[PDB]
């Protein structure tokens, strides 16, 4: 059994998603484009953090 992180707080902007993240433990956040070039990126979040994608 592994836990599920809290729901991030999501806001929107012109071709932007702004996510506020509240991890209890170091949580892996990754994202990729779903086109020809995924441009996969990942990072470990240890504390509350705001990410603009």
């Amino acid at each position: 059994r592994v836990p599920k992180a809290r729901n991030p707080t999501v806001t929107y902007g012109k071709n932007q998603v702004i996510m506020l993240l509240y991890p209890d433990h170091p949580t892996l956040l990754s994202y990729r484009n779903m086109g020809e070039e995924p441009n996969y990126q990942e990072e470990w979040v240890m504390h509350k953090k705001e990410v603009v994608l």
Binding site: R6, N7, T9, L20, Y22, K48
Partner: protein
């Protein structure tokens, strides 16, 4: 939610409490009686 001011009240003794903590109830796990939820942690503590 999750920032300074997620819960507010006019005075410490007032019973008027405004709360925006993004509280979403989740499905309990099979075979258990717990009440799971996904709630943004206290913005006051994060500010502290």
């Amino acid at each position: 939610p999750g920032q300074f001011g997620d819960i507010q009240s006019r005075t410490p003794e007032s019973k008027d409490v405004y709360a925006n903590t993004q509280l979403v109830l989740q499905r309990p796990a099979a075979g258990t009686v717990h009440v799971p939820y996904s709630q943004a942690p206290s913005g006051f503590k994060y500010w502290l």
